[PDB]
Amino acid sequence: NYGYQPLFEDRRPRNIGDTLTIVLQENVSASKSSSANASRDGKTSFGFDTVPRYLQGL
Amino acid sequence: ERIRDLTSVQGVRENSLIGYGLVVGLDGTGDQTTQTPFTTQTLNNMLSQLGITV
Protein backbone atom coordinates (compact mmCIF):
# COMPACT_ATOMS: atom_id res chain seq x y z
CA ASN A 1 0.00 0.00 0.00
CA TYR A 2 1.30 3.41 -1.02
CA GLY A 3 -1.25 5.83 0.43
CA TYR A 4 -3.53 8.31 -1.30
CA GLN A 5 -2.26 9.02 -4.81
CA PRO A 6 -3.97 11.86 -6.72
CA LEU A 7 -5.31 11.32 -10.23
CA PHE A 8 -5.07 14.67 -12.04
CA GLU A 9 -2.29 16.31 -10.02
CA ASP A 10 1.11 16.24 -11.70
CA ARG A 11 3.60 13.62 -10.57
CA ARG A 12 5.68 15.55 -8.04
CA PRO A 13 7.99 14.36 -5.26
CA ARG A 14 6.11 14.64 -1.99
CA ASN A 15 7.91 12.45 0.55
CA ILE A 16 11.45 11.37 1.35
CA GLY A 17 12.79 9.04 -1.32
CA ASP A 18 10.83 10.41 -4.27
CA THR A 19 12.85 11.17 -7.39
CA LEU A 20 12.96 14.43 -9.33
CA THR A 21 14.67 15.36 -12.59
CA ILE A 22 16.93 18.43 -12.60
CA VAL A 23 17.82 20.01 -15.93
CA LEU A 24 21.20 21.56 -15.21
CA GLN A 25 21.35 24.74 -17.30
CA GLU A 26 23.75 27.31 -15.86
CA ASN A 27 25.03 30.29 -17.83
CA VAL A 28 26.74 32.97 -15.74
CA SER A 29 28.87 35.67 -17.34
CA ALA A 30 30.11 38.67 -15.38
CA SER A 31 32.55 41.31 -16.56
CA LYS A 32 34.02 44.64 -15.55
CA SER A 33 36.60 47.00 -17.00
CA SER A 34 37.94 50.45 -16.27
CA SER A 35 40.62 52.89 -17.34
CA ALA A 36 42.02 56.32 -16.55
CA ASN A 37 44.52 58.61 -18.24
CA ALA A 38 46.09 62.04 -17.95
CA SER A 39 48.49 64.08 -20.05
CA ARG A 40 50.10 67.51 -19.96
CA ASP A 41 52.47 69.10 -22.48
CA GLY A 42 54.08 72.52 -22.39
CA LYS A 43 56.59 74.52 -24.42
CA THR A 44 57.86 78.06 -23.87
CA SER A 45 60.31 80.12 -25.88
CA PHE A 46 61.51 83.69 -26.29
CA GLY A 47 64.31 84.75 -28.60
CA PHE A 48 65.60 88.26 -29.28
CA ASP A 49 67.36 87.34 -32.51
CA THR A 50 68.28 90.98 -33.22
CA VAL A 51 68.31 93.19 -30.13
CA PRO A 52 67.81 96.93 -30.65
CA ARG A 53 70.47 99.11 -29.08
CA TYR A 54 68.16 100.78 -26.56
CA LEU A 55 67.20 97.31 -25.26
CA GLN A 56 70.60 95.56 -25.25
CA GLY A 57 71.02 96.04 -21.51
CA LEU A 58 67.79 94.23 -20.72
CA GLU B 1 -38.18 53.84 15.70
CA ARG B 2 -37.22 57.47 15.15
CA ILE B 3 -33.85 57.56 16.91
CA ARG B 4 -32.50 54.52 15.05
CA ASP B 5 -33.77 55.87 11.72
CA LEU B 6 -32.27 59.32 12.38
CA THR B 7 -28.91 58.59 14.04
CA SER B 8 -26.10 56.06 14.10
CA VAL B 9 -24.07 54.78 17.03
CA GLN B 10 -20.42 55.73 17.36
CA GLY B 11 -18.18 52.79 16.51
CA VAL B 12 -21.03 50.78 14.97
CA ARG B 13 -20.07 51.11 11.31
CA GLU B 14 -19.67 49.06 8.13
CA ASN B 15 -16.38 48.65 6.29
CA SER B 16 -15.75 47.84 2.62
CA LEU B 17 -14.05 44.65 1.44
CA ILE B 18 -12.72 43.95 -2.04
CA GLY B 19 -11.18 40.95 -3.76
CA TYR B 20 -10.41 39.35 -7.10
CA GLY B 21 -11.78 36.03 -8.28
CA LEU B 22 -12.71 33.81 -11.19
CA VAL B 23 -16.22 32.85 -12.28
CA VAL B 24 -16.53 29.46 -13.97
CA GLY B 25 -19.38 27.56 -15.54
CA LEU B 26 -20.43 30.20 -18.06
CA ASP B 27 -22.05 29.11 -21.32
CA GLY B 28 -19.31 30.42 -23.57
CA THR B 29 -19.82 33.97 -22.27
CA GLY B 30 -16.51 34.45 -20.47
CA ASP B 31 -13.42 36.46 -21.28
CA GLN B 32 -11.64 36.17 -24.61
CA THR B 33 -8.45 35.68 -22.53
CA THR B 34 -6.40 36.87 -25.49
CA GLN B 35 -7.07 40.50 -24.53
CA THR B 36 -7.23 39.86 -20.76
CA PRO B 37 -4.00 38.07 -19.80
CA PHE B 38 -4.78 38.18 -16.09
CA THR B 39 -7.64 35.69 -16.50
CA THR B 40 -5.37 32.98 -17.89
CA GLN B 41 -2.52 33.97 -15.57
CA THR B 42 -4.69 33.57 -12.48
CA LEU B 43 -6.22 30.35 -13.80
CA ASN B 44 -2.69 28.98 -14.20
CA ASN B 45 -1.92 30.19 -10.67
CA MET B 46 -4.96 28.32 -9.36
CA LEU B 47 -3.97 25.14 -11.21
CA SER B 48 -0.38 25.40 -9.98
CA GLN B 49 -1.67 25.75 -6.42
CA LEU B 50 -3.97 22.75 -6.93
CA GLY B 51 -1.14 20.63 -8.34
CA ILE B 52 -1.25 21.13 -12.12
CA THR B 53 1.65 23.02 -13.71
CA VAL B 54 0.71 24.06 -17.25
mmCIF file of C-alpha atoms in Angstrom:
data_model
loop_
_atom_site.group_PDB
_atom_site.id
_atom_site.type_symbol
_atom_site.label_atom_id
_atom_site.label_comp_id
_atom_site.label_asym_id
_atom_site.label_seq_id
_atom_site.Cartn_x
_atom_site.Cartn_y
_atom_site.Cartn_z
ATOM 1 C CA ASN A 1 0.000 0.000 0.000
ATOM 2 C CA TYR A 2 1.300 3.412 -1.015
ATOM 3 C CA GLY A 3 -1.252 5.829 0.433
ATOM 4 C CA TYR A 4 -3.528 8.309 -1.303
ATOM 5 C CA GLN A 5 -2.257 9.021 -4.814
ATOM 6 C CA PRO A 6 -3.971 11.864 -6.718
ATOM 7 C CA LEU A 7 -5.315 11.321 -10.227
ATOM 8 C CA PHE A 8 -5.071 14.673 -12.037
ATOM 9 C CA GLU A 9 -2.288 16.306 -10.018
ATOM 10 C CA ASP A 10 1.108 16.242 -11.701
ATOM 11 C CA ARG A 11 3.603 13.621 -10.569
ATOM 12 C CA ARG A 12 5.677 15.548 -8.035
ATOM 13 C CA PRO A 13 7.985 14.359 -5.264
ATOM 14 C CA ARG A 14 6.114 14.639 -1.987
ATOM 15 C CA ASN A 15 7.908 12.448 0.554
ATOM 16 C CA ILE A 16 11.449 11.368 1.354
ATOM 17 C CA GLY A 17 12.791 9.037 -1.321
ATOM 18 C CA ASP A 18 10.827 10.413 -4.269
ATOM 19 C CA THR A 19 12.847 11.169 -7.391
ATOM 20 C CA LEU A 20 12.963 14.433 -9.330
ATOM 21 C CA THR A 21 14.673 15.357 -12.591
ATOM 22 C CA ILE A 22 16.933 18.426 -12.604
ATOM 23 C CA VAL A 23 17.815 20.015 -15.933
ATOM 24 C CA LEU A 24 21.200 21.558 -15.215
ATOM 25 C CA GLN A 25 21.350 24.736 -17.298
ATOM 26 C CA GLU A 26 23.751 27.307 -15.862
ATOM 27 C CA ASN A 27 25.029 30.293 -17.833
ATOM 28 C CA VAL A 28 26.737 32.968 -15.736
ATOM 29 C CA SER A 29 28.868 35.668 -17.340
ATOM 30 C CA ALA A 30 30.110 38.673 -15.376
ATOM 31 C CA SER A 31 32.550 41.314 -16.557
ATOM 32 C CA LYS A 32 34.021 44.642 -15.552
ATOM 33 C CA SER A 33 36.598 46.997 -17.004
ATOM 34 C CA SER A 34 37.938 50.450 -16.274
ATOM 35 C CA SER A 35 40.621 52.889 -17.341
ATOM 36 C CA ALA A 36 42.018 56.319 -16.545
ATOM 37 C CA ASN A 37 44.516 58.609 -18.238
ATOM 38 C CA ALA A 38 46.086 62.036 -17.955
ATOM 39 C CA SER A 39 48.489 64.076 -20.053
ATOM 40 C CA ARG A 40 50.097 67.511 -19.956
ATOM 41 C CA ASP A 41 52.474 69.097 -22.481
ATOM 42 C CA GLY A 42 54.084 72.522 -22.392
ATOM 43 C CA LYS A 43 56.594 74.522 -24.423
ATOM 44 C CA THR A 44 57.857 78.058 -23.866
ATOM 45 C CA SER A 45 60.312 80.122 -25.883
ATOM 46 C CA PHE A 46 61.512 83.689 -26.287
ATOM 47 C CA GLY A 47 64.309 84.747 -28.605
ATOM 48 C CA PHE A 48 65.602 88.260 -29.277
ATOM 49 C CA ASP A 49 67.363 87.342 -32.507
ATOM 50 C CA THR A 50 68.282 90.979 -33.225
ATOM 51 C CA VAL A 51 68.314 93.185 -30.129
ATOM 52 C CA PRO A 52 67.813 96.931 -30.652
ATOM 53 C CA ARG A 53 70.466 99.109 -29.080
ATOM 54 C CA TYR A 54 68.155 100.779 -26.556
ATOM 55 C CA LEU A 55 67.200 97.307 -25.259
ATOM 56 C CA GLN A 56 70.600 95.563 -25.248
ATOM 57 C CA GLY A 57 71.017 96.045 -21.508
ATOM 58 C CA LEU A 58 67.788 94.233 -20.724
ATOM 59 C CA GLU B 1 -38.179 53.836 15.701
ATOM 60 C CA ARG B 2 -37.216 57.465 15.151
ATOM 61 C CA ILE B 3 -33.848 57.557 16.910
ATOM 62 C CA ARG B 4 -32.503 54.519 15.055
ATOM 63 C CA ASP B 5 -33.774 55.865 11.718
ATOM 64 C CA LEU B 6 -32.270 59.318 12.385
ATOM 65 C CA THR B 7 -28.911 58.593 14.038
ATOM 66 C CA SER B 8 -26.100 56.061 14.096
ATOM 67 C CA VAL B 9 -24.075 54.779 17.034
ATOM 68 C CA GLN B 10 -20.416 55.728 17.356
ATOM 69 C CA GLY B 11 -18.177 52.786 16.509
ATOM 70 C CA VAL B 12 -21.032 50.780 14.965
ATOM 71 C CA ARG B 13 -20.073 51.105 11.308
ATOM 72 C CA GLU B 14 -19.671 49.064 8.132
ATOM 73 C CA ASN B 15 -16.377 48.646 6.287
ATOM 74 C CA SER B 16 -15.754 47.841 2.624
ATOM 75 C CA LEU B 17 -14.052 44.646 1.443
ATOM 76 C CA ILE B 18 -12.716 43.947 -2.042
ATOM 77 C CA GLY B 19 -11.180 40.949 -3.759
ATOM 78 C CA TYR B 20 -10.410 39.353 -7.096
ATOM 79 C CA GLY B 21 -11.778 36.030 -8.277
ATOM 80 C CA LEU B 22 -12.708 33.807 -11.190
ATOM 81 C CA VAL B 23 -16.222 32.849 -12.276
ATOM 82 C CA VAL B 24 -16.528 29.463 -13.971
ATOM 83 C CA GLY B 25 -19.382 27.557 -15.544
ATOM 84 C CA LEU B 26 -20.427 30.203 -18.062
ATOM 85 C CA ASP B 27 -22.047 29.106 -21.319
ATOM 86 C CA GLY B 28 -19.315 30.423 -23.568
ATOM 87 C CA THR B 29 -19.822 33.967 -22.270
ATOM 88 C CA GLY B 30 -16.512 34.451 -20.470
ATOM 89 C CA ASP B 31 -13.422 36.461 -21.280
ATOM 90 C CA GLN B 32 -11.641 36.175 -24.605
ATOM 91 C CA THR B 33 -8.452 35.681 -22.529
ATOM 92 C CA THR B 34 -6.395 36.875 -25.486
ATOM 93 C CA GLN B 35 -7.069 40.505 -24.533
ATOM 94 C CA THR B 36 -7.232 39.856 -20.759
ATOM 95 C CA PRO B 37 -3.997 38.071 -19.805
ATOM 96 C CA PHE B 38 -4.779 38.181 -16.087
ATOM 97 C CA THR B 39 -7.640 35.695 -16.503
ATOM 98 C CA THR B 40 -5.369 32.979 -17.888
ATOM 99 C CA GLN B 41 -2.516 33.970 -15.570
ATOM 100 C CA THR B 42 -4.688 33.569 -12.476
ATOM 101 C CA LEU B 43 -6.217 30.349 -13.801
ATOM 102 C CA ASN B 44 -2.691 28.977 -14.198
ATOM 103 C CA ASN B 45 -1.919 30.186 -10.672
ATOM 104 C CA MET B 46 -4.958 28.315 -9.356
ATOM 105 C CA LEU B 47 -3.975 25.145 -11.206
ATOM 106 C CA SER B 48 -0.379 25.398 -9.975
ATOM 107 C CA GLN B 49 -1.673 25.746 -6.421
ATOM 108 C CA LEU B 50 -3.972 22.751 -6.934
ATOM 109 C CA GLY B 51 -1.142 20.629 -8.343
ATOM 110 C CA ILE B 52 -1.252 21.125 -12.122
ATOM 111 C CA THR B 53 1.654 23.015 -13.710
ATOM 112 C CA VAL B 54 0.714 24.064 -17.247
#
